[PDB]
Structure 1
Amino acid sequence: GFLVSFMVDARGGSMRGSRHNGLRVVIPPRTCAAPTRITCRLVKPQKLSTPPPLAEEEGLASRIIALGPTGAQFLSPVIVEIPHFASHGRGDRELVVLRSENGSVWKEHRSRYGESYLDQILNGMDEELGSLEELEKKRVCRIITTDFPLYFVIMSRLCQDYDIIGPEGGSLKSKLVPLVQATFPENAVTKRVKLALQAQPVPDELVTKLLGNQATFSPIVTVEPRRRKFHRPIGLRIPLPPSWTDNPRDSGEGDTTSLRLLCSVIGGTDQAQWEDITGTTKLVYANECANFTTNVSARFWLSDCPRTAEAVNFATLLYKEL
């Protein structure tokens, strides 16, 4: 029941499973000291004595794989690519590699030299590794590891990142988008709380496919958790939609401005109900960003949308596909 079974030595080697399973195992030169039979099999989740203990918004995004020989240790990282079947894209959820040493406990797989070192990990091997963008389009996950645990599986979960802000105030930055920032003044919160500033980039290819050149968008910025009220206004900084940074079609001051500020206050994983709030708040333009305040946590999204009455319809159509 092996998807792949091949001999490998110090020269390295690679193998792909059938097109029906999409597995790719890459063993670079100098990682395997002696001739070794590399294998991979699929594992039925219902056959596990202790399956991954999934929380409410967690799910398995790939098949469970058992790479052989179990317990194999490599001199430097090896690469395993597998397709995922996650039911979402970018947003409130992320994909994480889980591993289990003996089938009893499941933890996040740690890789010290990962995606930032693909070319170095290859050790001169003549193999092509696609970028994270290309893997995203193809719905493929890449596991970089120096050993084979009993099991690997991809899990889908709510983003785990957060920072802590108390009554002294502070600032939050996005992990993905550098200019995305939230400023919490003193007394905005009454105690030390966990907060996250989520910024989801919007790919031009998707916007073009769905809306042509009718609108452009900023990244979607969400102050997490949603459904929270602050005791003082919170400062938010969002990079402008790309067509607006290039050349604004108007001052961005009037209510008929083509630069629309959209807001969604509803709770729920990857749920939004967009409302055009342009003109309800003062926007200050500086450093190729819009700067404004909010008294509540919510999702925020800017759009340079000349057909202004269609901004919510365009946002809704696009958000469904993100």
Structure 2
Amino acid sequence: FLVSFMVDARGGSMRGSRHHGMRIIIPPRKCTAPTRITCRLVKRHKLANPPPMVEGEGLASRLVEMGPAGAQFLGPVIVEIPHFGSMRGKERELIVLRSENGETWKEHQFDSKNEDLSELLNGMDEELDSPEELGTKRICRIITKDFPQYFAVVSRIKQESNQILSSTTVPLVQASFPEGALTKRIRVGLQAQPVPEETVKKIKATFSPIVTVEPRRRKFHKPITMTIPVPPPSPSLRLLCSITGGTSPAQWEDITGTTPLTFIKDCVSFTTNVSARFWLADCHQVLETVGLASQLYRELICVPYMAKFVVFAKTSLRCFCMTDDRVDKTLEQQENFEEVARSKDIEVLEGKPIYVDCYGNLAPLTQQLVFNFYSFKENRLPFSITSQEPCGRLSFLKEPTKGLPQTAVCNLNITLPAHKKA
């Protein structure tokens, strides 16, 4: 199917012709009646009041209008939707939103998960390998017993949540609420975004994980403990915080003076009374630690995507970075072009422009060249092209410099078809 199909209480195992990965499964005796099931990945621009995102959270897939606005299934059913969010091995997770009428946005979840029982002797059970297999195939399994009008898939950080709380990413990040500091025993989540040194090179002066507590800007009645592991080395140490909540971006400031900084081997324990963003920075210049943080912060909040890199040629080049587009590009196959190199899946930065260098048969015509990658947009990069050498390889890099080697993103080998010259 492309968008829709009918199905009876005999149950249906239908994959989506258009967007590879897409797969609705309705086990037997679970549909109310024969019904029109639908699953269309509507463009983000087209819709209004799209599900709200915060600073550091990221849209994995497009949004998925479903076939029956209110169908209530007897069993459960599965919608496998494919995504392109970079997972980074549990450094980030996928939280699944749902709107009943595309005005109100809520989280969606099912308490009970089983394999052999939901299928009910379905002949092609075909559970997609292990859950880890889904995490590798960039599939998100949604399991519901009623179709909400719109799902979102989203890549947050891990936000281990309870109602004592230490992080599943980094364990020296134990932040536990004390006895009687919350009026209603409410769920609270702890997020723990580390920082690669490799990217600290970008802009010298060190940093620790960015720790956050998910119910934000809510005062805690009794002081709440925190533990954060320290940066390595280059008063020396400044602690930062932002209290801003939800949709708006945060702002940083140094609060070394207003917080007592208790030391334990490898980390720091301290109290606050507000749920907010905490981040450490050992360096011996203090006026810069605000802005040298908010330069780095800008880099960290960008969303990662496992994008394909494809290069199209026709004697003469057009270079593309993309995800979720139909492979058989009509424009190029008609202008008589040839896909010269479609690469593996690669983490790229939804915002950060990406460069291209040429190590090949011929040089580019006639300044350096770049194109900004965005998620779910086609990304145009058009070109102008000893005679002994037949072929050449070009590569894409995130750093432009020639002083130190800043290794590249993708190495691809190309070959002009050469039906004529120019």
The interval holding the TM-score normalised by the smaller chain is 0.5 to 0.7
Q: Distance in 2 between matches of 1:120 and 1:306?
A: 60
Does the 8 A contact of 1:39 with 1:67 survive in 2? yes
Does the 8 A contact of 2:14 with 2:23 survive in 1? yes
CA deviation string 1:8-39 (max 9, x = no partner) = 999974512413xx6611539xx4379x8984
Answering whether residue 213 of structure 2 is matched by residue 222 of structure 1, we say: yes
TM-score, normalization by structure 2? 0.44
Answering whether residue 293 of structure 2 is matched by residue 312 of structure 1, we say: yes
Q: Distance in 1 between matches of 2:99 and 2:64?
A: 12
Q: How does 1:140-155 map to 2 (within 5 A)?
A: 141-145=140-144, 147=145, 149=147, 151-154=149-152
Q: How does 1:99-118 map to 2 (within 5 A)?
A: 109-114=108-113
Q: Distance in 2 between matches of 1:96 and 1:109?
A: 5
Q: How does 1:119-138 map to 2 (within 5 A)?
A: 125=126, 127-128=128-129, 131=132, 134=135
Larger Rg: 2
Residue in 2 that maps onto 1:283? 261
CA deviation string 1:261-314 (max 9, x = no partner) = 221134553421112334653322337542112355432123566987455245
Residue in 2 that maps onto 1:237? 226
Q: Distance in 2 between matches of 1:316 and 1:275?
A: 13
Which among 193, 206, 227 is matched to residue 202 of structure 1? 193
Does the 8 A contact of 2:110 with 2:143 survive in 1? yes
SS at match of 2:15: strand
Does the 8 A contact of 1:181 with 1:197 survive in 2? no
Mean CA deviation greater in 292-301 or 210-219: 210-219
Q: Cα 1:174–1:118, aligned 2, differ >3 Å: closer, same or farther? A: farther
Which among 245, 256, 263 is matched to residue 236 of structure 2? 256
TM-score, normalization by structure 1? 0.54
Q: Cα 1:268–1:96, aligned 2, differ >3 Å: closer, same or farther? A: closer
Q: Cα 1:239–1:16, aligned 2, differ >3 Å: closer, same or farther? A: farther
Shift of 1:41: 4.6
Q: Cα 1:277–1:305, aligned 2, differ >3 Å: closer, same or farther? A: same
Q: Distance in 1 between matches of 2:240 and 2:148?
A: 47
Count, aligned residues: 271
Letter in 2 for 1:298: A
Q: Cα 1:296–1:77, aligned 2, differ >3 Å: closer, same or farther? A: closer
Shift of 1:133: 9.3
Q: Distance in 2 between matches of 1:316 and 1:106?
A: 27
Does the 8 A contact of 1:262 with 1:300 survive in 2? yes
Letter in 2 for 1:302: L
- In structure 1, runs of 5+ residues without a counterpart are 45-52, 164-171
SS at match of 2:293: helix
Does the 8 A contact of 1:66 with 1:152 survive in 2? no
Percent of pairs with identical residues? 22
Shift of 1:83: 5.3
Does the 8 A contact of 1:218 with 1:238 survive in 2? no
Q: Distance in 1 between matches of 2:214 and 2:148?
A: 38
RMSD, aligned α-carbons: 5.9
Does the 8 A contact of 1:2 with 1:39 survive in 2? no
Q: Cα 1:305–1:314, aligned 2, differ >3 Å: closer, same or farther? A: farther
Q: Distance in 1 between matches of 2:105 and 2:249?
A: 29
Larger RCO (CA under 8 A, 6+ residues apart): 1
Answering whether residue 32 of structure 2 is matched by residue 32 of structure 1, we say: no
Letter in 1 for 2:190: A
SS at match of 1:217: coil
Answering whether residue 313 of structure 2 is matched by residue 301 of structure 1, we say: no
Does the 8 A contact of 1:201 with 1:219 survive in 2? yes
Q: Cα 1:41–1:273, aligned 2, differ >3 Å: closer, same or farther? A: closer
Q: Cα 1:69–1:301, aligned 2, differ >3 Å: closer, same or farther? A: closer
Residue in 2 that maps onto 1:173? 165
Does the 8 A contact of 1:4 with 1:38 survive in 2? yes
Does the 8 A contact of 1:4 with 1:17 survive in 2? no
Structure having the larger proportion of residues in helix: 1
Q: Distance in 2 between matches of 1:231 and 1:110?
A: 30
- In structure 2, runs of 5+ residues without a counterpart are 43-48, 55-61, 86-90, 304-422
Does the 8 A contact of 2:236 with 2:283 survive in 1? no
Q: Distance in 2 between matches of 1:173 and 1:302?
A: 20
SS at match of 1:321: coil
Shift of 1:256: 1.3
Q: How does 1:24-103 map to 2 (within 5 A)?
A: 24-27=22-25, 31-32=27-28, 39-42=37-40, 62-66=63-67, 70-71=71-72, 73-74=74-75, 77-81=77-81, 95-98=96-99
Does the 8 A contact of 1:97 with 1:143 survive in 2? no
CA deviation string 1:32-73 (max 9, x = no partner) = 379x898425499xxxxxxxx999999xx7232115995554
Letter in 1 for 2:226: R
